[PDB]
Each structure stands twice: as C-alpha cells, then as structure tokens.
Ligand binder design. Structure first.
Ligand SMILES: Nc1ncnc2c1ncn2[C@@H]1O[C@H](COP(=O)(O)OP(=O)(O)O)[C@@H](O)[C@H]1O
Ligand SMILES: Nc1ncnc2c1ncn2[C@@H]1O[C@H](COP(=O)(O)OP(=O)(O)O)[C@@H](O)[C@H]1O
Length: 203
C-alpha cells in the first residue's frame, strides 16, 4: 500500500504518519525530515535547499524528485508525508511508480482551517536532537526535554508557507480527486480522532 498525506503545514500530517508507520508497518518518507537532515549534514542538497526552506518557499522540484528517486523503498508499504507538494512532483511520482508496476493507493487530505493551522504552527516545538514534535498547548513537552521553536514557525514565515501551500500545493487536491483516490480527513479534531479517521479511509 502506498499512501500520500496532503494538507497545509500544521495539519498534523507528520504526527499521523509516524503513528500509522509504527503501528501498521509503513516506511515513512518525509521530505521535510530528509531535507532537514541534509541541511544539518551540509550535503549539496542541504546547502541548496536551506535558502528556500528558511524563506518558507518550496525547494525546487528537480532536487525533490531526485531525492525521492534516491530514497524510494523497494517493496513494502509507504507513506509519502508532505510529498508531492507540486503538480510536477506528483507527475514524477506517478511516472516513477508506473515503471515499477505500482501506484498511489490513497491520498489523504488533511483539512483544517487557517486559524487552526496558525495556532498549531505557532505552538509547535521540536526536540532538535530527535525531531520529536510537541505543542505548547495540545501536547506539551516534559520539563526535562530541551525543545526549540523552528525559525520557519514564526508568524511571517508561517504566513508565507500557507500562501505557498494555497498556490502550489492545493492544486494537488483536484489532481488526485480526478484519479478517484482522494480521501478527506477532518484534521481539526484531536489526535486520537484524526487517527481513527485515517484508519477508516485506508480500510
Ligand atoms: N489533531 C491535533 N490537534 C492539536 N494539535 C496537533 C494535532 N496534530 C498535531 N498537532 C500539533 O500541531 C503541530 C503540527 O503537527 P505536525 O504533525 O508537525 O503537522 P504537519 O506535519 O502537517 O506540519 C505540532 O505542534 C503537533 O504537536
Ligand atoms: N515535497 C517538497 N517539495 C518542496 N519543498 C519541500 C517539500 N517538502 C519539504 N519541503 C521544504 O521543507 C520545508 C519544511 O518542510 P516540513 O519539515 O515538512 O515542514 P511543514 O510540515 O511545516 O511543511 C518546506 O517549507 C519546504 O521549504
């Protein structure tokens, strides 16, 4: 089974993907997480990608497509979390899979209002070591654990990231709808309720 998680930043896609991957045996492919590792490691990808990420812009398609080609799991179930984010990326993904006799099975759209997106991103805190995600209100970190606020989770960059999502990523809703594979998730609900919906639409 191959899944794509689609939706605005802050929708809870990473949180749901981690849970589903651990519980149902999926390889979790997060372009965000992989890019962050590349930036930390100072690879050619990381050095190039950094500028776009810091401004809240998408990293150029060719870089992302190459990345996916390099990490795509041979066999087994896969969650693409936050990829594709553009029509060109989605077209490349479909071509990739076709050559392997595979296809995307379901695309889950994590629907959530802008007001909630902004609350989620502004309260988002991460363990910079482990990548573990918390929220100051909805899932506070333990006192013993060091966390930071991502620089791209500041108001100005959040605004840009949301605009970028609406312009470049939201057209993927119709792209996948017309393939007959889109499923709607009310991503505004609490974590456990969202997870129940996720489990529902893939069974
Ligand atoms: N259903 C939810 N309700 C409230 N907060 C959530 C929910 N899902 C995730 N969060 C919190 O919202 C923020 C965004 O979650 P995340 O999984 O990083 O979203 P995405 O990967 O879509 O950007 C995080 O701080 C996380 O702790
Ligand atoms: N599929 C992709 N295509 C282009 N850029 C990407 C992609 N995935 C991640 N990025 C870049 O990485 C940044 C951070 O992504 P991520 O860690 O997923 O944060 P969020 O969950 O808030 O979107 C994005 O704002 C963008 O610059």
């Amino acid at each position: 089974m191959i899944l794509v998680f689609l939706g605005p930043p802050g929708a809870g896609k990473g949180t749901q993907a981690k849970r589903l991957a651990k519980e149902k045996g999926f390889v979790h492919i997060s372009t965000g997480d992989i890019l962050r590792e590349a930036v930390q490691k100072g690879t050619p990808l990381g050095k190039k990608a950094k500028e776009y990420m810091e401004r809240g812009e998408l990293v150029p398609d060719d870089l992302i497509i190459a990345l996916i080609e390099e990490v795509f799991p041979k066999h087994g179930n896969v969650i693409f979390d936050g990829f594709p984010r553009t029509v060109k990326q989605a077209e490349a993904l479909d071509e990739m899979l076709e050559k392997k006799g595979l296809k995307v099975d379901h695309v889950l759209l994590f629907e959530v209002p802008d007001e909630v997106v902004i609350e989620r991103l502004s309260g988002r805190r991460i363990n910079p070591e482990t990548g573990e995600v918390y929220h100051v209100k909805y899932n506070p970190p333990p006192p013993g654990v060091k966390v930071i606020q991502r620089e791209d989770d500041k108001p100005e960059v959040i605004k840009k990231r949301l605009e970028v999502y609406r312009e470049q990523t939201a057209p993927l809703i119709e792209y996948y709808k017309k393939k007959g594979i889109l499923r709607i998730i009310d991503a505004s609900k609490p974590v456990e309720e969202v997870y129940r919906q996720v489990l529902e639409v893939i069974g």
